[model samples]
Target: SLIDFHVHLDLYPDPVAVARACEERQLTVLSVTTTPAAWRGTLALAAGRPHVWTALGFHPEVVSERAADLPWFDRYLPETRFVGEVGLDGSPSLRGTWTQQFAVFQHILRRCEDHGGRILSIHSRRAESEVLNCLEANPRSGTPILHWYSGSVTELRRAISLGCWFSVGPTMVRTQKGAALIRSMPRDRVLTETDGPFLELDGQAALPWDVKSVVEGLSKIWQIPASEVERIVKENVSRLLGT
Candidate 1:
């Protein structure tokens, strides 16, 4: 139950130290890297560790900078089963590269399909519906793990029907919008994430262990026990991995 399905350990002030802390605590965490080159080292920092999964990613926000890395993305497509922080971000600021954004995402999805699916932790920001549509039209072998979802209730149901999974964080669980989504999610379709150093908790950066609090919060939201929630979480991950 100490698993934080998504965290950005690479963004921390001292990534190696944070990795050590995770190892010492036996915490199962996925440190999502936001850039292609960053992915390799991020995984290496915790390389050979059973408890940490370093995700390979190319954030949509900085597409302008890494847009040329199209070949770079292709080169590392199958290096790992995990992928993330990689999706459409249509916020006002990142809208200029809308076309390119979808291009990159489409390529990623196509490659995943070719590779027989990949475990993805995606970011859909303001383009949730668009991203969902792509997944619908081009279904891959791997089930999508939606990270910090903030889509409409209707869209949420569509995602659920499409066999998509969700990862919740403190920021999301603390708001009415977030809670409403969680309250409506089908049982065992949810997992916990820290979104660390980015998900500010009570005016501070979140840490991986914050997921324990999220599990407790989910218990209250679901009117169930924390232990049961933990069991359900593990079951959710097992199903996601098809293990």
Candidate 2:
């Protein structure tokens, strides 16, 4: 009944070993890829691991660098019900390519629209408004779950109104602002994530098992028992995937 809705298994030192760890712990993990090319290997790693799902994505940070392979996302879309590590990144360093990211994000949304039942895990970063704009325009694209969202309360409200779900992890909940933003979210719309190998804890890279800390964090914010938080998150996962 453990849940880690987002993590890059492929980014770990030994992805297969990490994947087996996930299965051994019985954690429901979503291995979100940075590029479509990584999906096949991740899919194979997750093979026979029912609780592990692999998502195909073209990370916005690598949008320009990996532009040529964007078309492969469409080809691989039908193989899985998840899409992620995708969306807009409005960080200053990547500002110049905002236009390119915008076009690619829209195209990805349209592809998901063409193939229904896709659960998208998005990266909004400093571009929450633009991300929401794309989602609003492509309403039927898919069910979106924003990952590590760092937007304003106003934008969070807008995202909620647009029927988006949120995936929170240790990095997001450690700060006052992040916890406050999470407090404002509707309980039912929130799920847990680790964004592992990218997120560090106690000077070490976080693992899927570390998501339990997120559950603990949520319990504190929601004034509920950690056990209850776990059940709610598990239910939210089932509800999101309709499984």
Candidate 3:
């Protein structure tokens, strides 16, 4: 079984088309991460498919509007078992203001702690150290998967010490930094993702069918067989989701 831990199927122009491809490719599961604006659509789409699960949270780029709506998370969180695409970002274009992003992120962290046992997929762009500090300050029982991790070697080490899992995508295959991160990651703490329709491989945007390619890349990078990488990632997803 294969799982794509971070995919933006909602952003795809043709989500049903992608769904059909997912079904045909034998992709066992897909965890779709959504921003505050798109959470409803992601949940509606997940409802129509057995293999799909949703992660609801606000992205830092849109933190201003999301800050005011933090309390609503209590009502919607029970609708899904996962929390995130949530974390801090230092990118000027993505995060409008540090104050707003920090407030929104801390609120989500509090909610995740309160909800205990719900898995989280984090997005810790340029603000990895700050993100790690927050996670360490408020540790939760559930597993936390860092999506498309771009932290420094030191930060990655700190995250590992905190028992966080790191997700890698095809971008790793194309970038030396991503490859080095994968090489240094602990096997059990590593998983595969696509971050599809956004981070592509060979100039071809991933569309679920490309999970096999991701698995193959993991196999090469980790010096494991493709089948084993597939098995471990499947187990990783199951453990995180408590299924």
The number of the candidate with the highest lDDT is 2
Q: List the residue pairs that clash in candidate 1.
A: none
* Backbone Cα, N, C clashes tallied per candidate: 0, 0, 0
- CA shift at 198, candidate 1, in angstroms? 1.0
Candidate 3: which pairs clash?
Answer: none
Computed on alpha carbons, the lDDT of every model, listed in order, comes to 0.84, 0.91, 0.76
Best of the two (1, 3) by TM-score: 1
Error of 1 at 35 (Å): 1.8
Which window of ten consecutive residues has the lowest lDDT sum in model 1? 69-78
* Cand. 2 TM to true fold: 0.97
TM-score of each: 0.96, 0.97, 0.90
Q: How many angstroms is residue 182 displaced in model 1 relative to the true structure, after the best TM-score fit?
A: 0.8
Q: Give Cα distance to truth, residue 102, candidate 1, Å.
A: 0.8
lDDT string for model 1 (1-243, tens) is: 577998999888998888888888888897887877786678888776788887777888877778776666667867888887788987998888999889888888887788888888999988899989888877863678889999899999999998888999887777899999998788878999989999888898888888888988888888999999988988888887782
TM-score of 3: 0.90
